[PDB]
Amino acid sequence: FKDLNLTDAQKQQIREIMKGQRDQMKRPPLEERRAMHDIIASDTFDKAKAEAQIAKMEEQRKANMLAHMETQNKIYNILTPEQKKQFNANFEKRLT
Amino acid sequence: FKDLNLTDAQKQQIREIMKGQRDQMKRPPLEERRAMHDIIASDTFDKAKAEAQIAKMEEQRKANMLAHMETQNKIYNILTPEQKKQFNANFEKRLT
């Protein structure tokens, strides 16, 4: 989400960045999915199992949030000042 | 995503359950939103500032994941066995 009258140069640059995003971003193994699922799809809610499962994903979610932040920053520093202006502006508005 | 063939009863019960969701789910303060933003919208990317910020939310993301999990489970235990059956069925086909 970012609608700032881009540029052919940038449109592509932020695409090359996106690519190196899909690679620093270790999404979750079917195993985990199945485990989450299984804890939910159960006669009763084993909380300890649930917490154990959410804790085993901590490190990963952390690394991903970080990668997402770097990436968003790299794109940001491809913007021009009036674009950074529009960018920030949209956000301050998107708080509503 | 789970269309299944409910019941006026179930449809409503899960609305009630959902209502008990919006109140166990501590949404994130404008402050933190602003802080994420600021770290990203910056001449340069301060990693320590980024990790500290992601760390500071640890407690909340966890509590929220947990709640989402209980809630999906209470919903589940309201279904009937052929719905529990479709439910699971969908999922296994949903990994693809």
Side-chain angles (χ1 to χ4, degrees), chain A residues 1-12 14-15 17-18 20-21 24-25 27-58 60 62-89 91-92 95-96, chain B residues 1-2 4-15 17-18 20-21 25 28-59 62-84 86-89 91 95-96:
Chain A
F1 193 104
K2 45 175 31 184
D3 346 37
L4 301 326
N5 274 359
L6 237 330
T7 260
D8 275 344
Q10 302 161 316
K11 288 190 181 189
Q12 160 81 198
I14 92 167
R15 167 172 284 263
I17 281 127
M18 285 311 183
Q21 153 115 310
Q24 298 170 12
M25 201 114 166
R27 68 198 171 222
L30 284 58
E31 294 309 298
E32 307 321 310
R33 316 256 177 80
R34 293 195 188 264
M36 297 286 284
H37 194 247
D38 299 325
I39 299 178
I40 279 149
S42 161
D43 259 14
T44 182
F45 189 73
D46 202 326
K47 196 206 171 66
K49 297 225 66 112
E51 284 149 350
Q53 178 72 26
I54 301 173
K56 155 159 171 50
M57 289 164 318
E58 214 156 34
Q60 204 48 46
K62 277 159 83 184
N64 278 356
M65 302 198 42
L66 196 60
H68 186 231
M69 305 190 61
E70 279 151 344
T71 288
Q72 292 176 331
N73 180 83
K74 260 203 239 287
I75 294 167
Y76 187 84
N77 298 299
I78 246 33
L79 266 27
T80 69
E82 350 122 358
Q83 286 176 320
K84 304 189 172 176
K85 184 204 254 70
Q86 206 135 354
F87 190 114
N88 295 328
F91 165 105
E92 311 292 355
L95 305 219
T96 36
Chain B
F1 184 177
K2 40 83 162 319
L4 198 73
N5 288 355
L6 296 215
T7 274
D8 279 331
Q10 295 162 318
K11 291 189 184 183
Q12 162 82 187
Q13 287 301 56
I14 94 189
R15 199 145 191 123
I17 287 164
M18 285 296 191
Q21 155 118 316
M25 186 124 169
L30 269 45
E31 283 322 301
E32 305 318 299
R33 287 228 60 153
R34 293 199 178 282
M36 286 301 239
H37 195 239
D38 299 320
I39 290 166
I40 278 149
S42 161
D43 258 6
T44 167
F45 181 78
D46 203 309
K47 200 199 184 185
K49 300 216 67 89
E51 285 149 325
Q53 177 70 31
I54 291 155
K56 146 154 191 203
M57 294 162 314
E58 222 146 30
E59 208 174 5
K62 284 155 80 165
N64 281 357
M65 299 202 43
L66 192 27
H68 188 238
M69 254 160 140
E70 271 135 18
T71 278
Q72 285 169 337
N73 177 267
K74 269 184 220 292
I75 282 165
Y76 190 89
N77 293 306
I78 283 225
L79 301 180
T80 88
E82 71 262 31
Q83 293 180 317
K84 274 192 168 100
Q86 213 144 343
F87 184 104
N88 293 147
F91 172 92
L95 282 195
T96 14

